[PDB]
Design a binder for this molecule. Structure first.
Ligand SMILES: [Cl-]
Ligand code: NA
Length: 250
C-alpha cells in the first residue's frame, strides 16, 4: 500500500522578489535554452520563460514539481522492497539494492536520486560498464557512467573505473556515490534540483544546466519514481521569494 512519510521541510526565504531574481538571472548568465514543441530542438528562452521557470511559487504547490525541492544530499531510509520497484527491468542493479542504499547512507545522497543516476546511466551499451570490462588482466566496474564520454563510453568509462581502482561492483557503487556527492552536491547551497539550476543563494555562480526546464524535467522523473514506489519524499528545502505571500510565512 501507499506509504506516507513525515516531511522535514526547510523554508529558505530569499531577500529578493521573483522579479528581481529574474533580473539578476538574465544579467548573470547567458545561453538559457528551452525545447521546441517537438523536442531535440533547442532554442533561446525568453525572459518571461526564464522567470516562469524560476517560479518557486508555482512549483511548491504542485505535486510533482515540489520535487524540484527534494534534498538530494539526504539519505531517506526508504524500504528496500519499495526500491526494488525502480529496478524491476534491471537485474544487475536490482541485485545491488543493498549496496546502493548503504552507499546512499554513507556518502550522503538521496537513494532515489542515486539510483536514477545508475538507471539512466547503465542503459543500452553502457550496461557493460556495470557488468565489468576487462583491462590488462584485472576487471573494472562503473555504475554511473563516470567519465564515460559519449564518443567512446566503454573505453573511457572503464578506464576511468581502472584509474579509480573500481575492481569490484561494490567499490564502483560506493566510489561512484562519493563522486556524485563531490560533483553535484559539493555546495550546501545547491542540494536541490532548484538550487542546482538557479543557484539562488550565490547569484552568478555555477548553475548545473542551461535548459530552463532541467529541474522541472528531473523533478517529474524523481516524483514519478516515488509514485511508482507508492511513497513520497521526506526532506525538502523550499526557496521562497520575498514577494510570495502564499509561502513567505508558512
Ligand atoms: Cl539547497
Ligand atoms: Na545574460
Amino acid at each position: 500500500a501507499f506509504k506516507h512519510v513525515k516531511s522535514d521541510i526547510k523554508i529558505e526565504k530569499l531577500n529578493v522578489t521573483l522579479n528581481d531574481a529574474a533580473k539578476k538571472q538574465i544579467n548573470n548568465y547567458t545561453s538559457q535554452q528551452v525545447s521546441n514543441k517537438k523536442n531535440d530542438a533547442w532554442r533561446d528562452a525568453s525572459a518571461t520563460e526564464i522567470k516562469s521557470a524560476m517560479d518557486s511559487g508555482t512549483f511548491i504547490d504542485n505535486e510533482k514539481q515540489k520535487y524540484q525541492f527534494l534534498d538530494l544530499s539526504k539519505y531517506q531510509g526508504i524500504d528496500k522492497n519499495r526500491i526494488k520497484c525502480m529496478l524491476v527491468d534491471r537485474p544487475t542493479l536490482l541485485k545491488h539494492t543493498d549496496d546502493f542504499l548503504k552507499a546512499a547512507k554513507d556518502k550522503h545522497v538521496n537513494e532515489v536520486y542515486l539510483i536514477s543516476h545508475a538507471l539512466l546511466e547503465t542503459g543500452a551499451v553502457k550496461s557493460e560498464l556495470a557488468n565489468g570490462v576487462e583491462i590488462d588482466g584485472k576487471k573494472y566496474y562503473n555504475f554511473y557512467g563516470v567519465g564515460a564520454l559519449d564518443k567512446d563510453p566503454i573505453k573511457t568509462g572503464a578506464e576511468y573505473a581502472k584509474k579509480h581502482g573500481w575492481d569490484t561492483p561494490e567499490k564502483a557503487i560506493s566510489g561512484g556515490a562519493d563522486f556524485i556527492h563531490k560533483h553535484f552536491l559539493s555546495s550546501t547551497d545547491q542540494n536541490t534540483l532548484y538550487s542546482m539550476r538557479w543557484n539562488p543563494k550565490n547569484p552568478g555562480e555555477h548553475q548545473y544546466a542551461t535548459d530552463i526546464k532541467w529541474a522541472e524535467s528531473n523533478a517529474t522523473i524523481i516524483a514519478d519514481f516515488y509514485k511508482n514506489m507508492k511513497t513520497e519524499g521526506k526532506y525538502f528545502k523550499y526557496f521562497v521569494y520575498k514577494d510570495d505571500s502564499k509561502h513567505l510565512n508558512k
